[PDB]
Amino acid sequence: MNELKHLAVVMDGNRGVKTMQKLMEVCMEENISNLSLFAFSTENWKRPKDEIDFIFELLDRCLDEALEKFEKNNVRLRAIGDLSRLEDKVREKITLVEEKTKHCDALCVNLAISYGARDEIIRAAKRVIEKKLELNEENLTQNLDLPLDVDLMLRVGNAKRLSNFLLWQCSYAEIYFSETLFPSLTKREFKRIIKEFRNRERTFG
Amino acid sequence: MNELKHLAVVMDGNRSQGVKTMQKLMEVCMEENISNLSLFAFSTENWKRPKDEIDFIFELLDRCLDEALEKFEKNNVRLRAIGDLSRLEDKVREKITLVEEKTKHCDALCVNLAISYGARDEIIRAAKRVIEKKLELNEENLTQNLDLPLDVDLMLRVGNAKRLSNFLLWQCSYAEIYFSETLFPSLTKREFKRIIKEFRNRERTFGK
Ligand SMILES: CC(C)=CCC/C(C)=C\CC/C(C)=C\COP(=O)(O)O
Ligand SMILES: CC(C)=CCC/C(C)=C\CC/C(C)=C\COP(=O)(O)O
Known about the structure:
The structure is a homodimer.
Chain A: E1 6-11, H1 18-29, E2 34-41, H2 49-70, E3 76-80, H3 88-101, E4 108-115, H4 117-130, H5 137-142, E5 152-156, E6 174-178, H6 187-199
Parallel strand pairs in A: 1-2, 1-5, 2-4, 3-4, 5-6
The complex binds ligand FFT (2 copies).
C-alpha cells in the first residue's frame, strides 16, 4: 500500500560494517532505489581535531571499499553536502568513485559528507536565485543536493533527533527509532521495520 | 542539565478534557520555565482535506480563539499565530489579530499557534524576507526571519503517527524528539513533568 522509494539511515554520533552490507543487500531485495547515509555533518567540524581525522580515516576506508565493490555489484555512489570544506585528497577519491559508479542501476547510495540540511537549503535557495527562478517550494526542492523526498527515516541507536539530516526532504518522512548501544542490526529486523512502514497510514496531510 | 525553552506539540491529525489537559500543559510550562509552547492547528497540506473536515476544525479553532480571548491575558499568556495567515477567511484573521493584540504584552508564557502553516512555506517566506531586506542569504539570516526564529528543544508527538508532518522542520534540526502514544486528553501533569525530566537528562551534543 506504501511505496518505499527512499530510505534514510543515521547512526549514533557518540564520541561494524556487516550491518552496512546487510543494509545495502536488503534495499536491493526490496526494490529500494535510494539509500541515504549520514557520514559527516556541517556541525561536526567543531568536534575535536582528533575525533575528526579519525572519522575521515574511516571514511577513506569506506570509499576504497566502494571503488572495489560498488561497480561490479551495480551500486551507485553520490556525495551530497558542502564538499568544498573537504581536503582535496578525499574530494578527488569521491569524484572518482562517483564517476566509476555513475552508471550503476540497482541502488543509489547517497553519502552525506560535510552535510547539513540548513546549509543544503540555503545553497538550494541560491541556486534558485542565480537561475533567476521564483523562490517557491517546488523550485527549491528541485535545487537541493537531493531533491528526492524521504519515505522512511531510520535512526540506528539511542539518539532521538534528526541532527540536521535531510530536514526538508523529511517533512512527511515516517520516522523510526531503533534502539541500540551498538550500531547493530539484522537483515530481518530491517525487513521487519520496512514491513511496518508499508502498512502504516500516510496521509501527506 | 538541558534547558527547555521551547516545547512543540503535535497530536495525531487522523481518525472538553482536551481543554482541561491543555490548561495542565500550560501550567506545567510555567512551573517548568518553558517560555514557548508551540501547537499545530492547521497546515498548508490540510487544505486538501475534505471541505467538511476543514469546516469542523475551524469551528473548534474558533471556539479555542474565544477561550483565549477570555482566559489568556488575565493569566499573562501571550498568543502568536504563525503560518500563512493570508489563506484564512477574514473573520478568522481579525479574531486572531484581536487576541494577539490583547495578549501582545503577556510575560509568563508564549503560545505559538501554527495555522495554515507549513515548514517548507515558512522557510520560503523567510528567504524572501532576507532577500527583500538585502541581507546575505545564509543560515543565521534565514533563521532570524522565520515566523518563529526559536529553536525547538523538545518536539512532542501525542498520538500514534511517527513523523513531523511539515512542522517546524528548520527549528527542529537538533530538537529532541519524543513520541508518546496516547490521546492528548489522557495526559497528566505528572506525565508532562516526567517527559520533561527525561529530556533534561538526555545527552545533547548539537553535533559536538
Ligand atoms: C564512518 C563514517 C565516515 C562516519 C560515521 C558516521 C556515523 C556512524 C554516525 C554519524 C552521524 C551524524 C553525522 C550525526 C548524528 O548525530 P547524533 O547521533 O544525533 O549526535
Ligand atoms: C482542535 C484544533 C483547532 C486543531 C486540532 C489539531 C489536531 C488535533 C491535529 C492536526 C495536527 C496537524 C496539523 C498535523 C498532524 O498530522 P499527522 O497526525 O502527522 O497526520
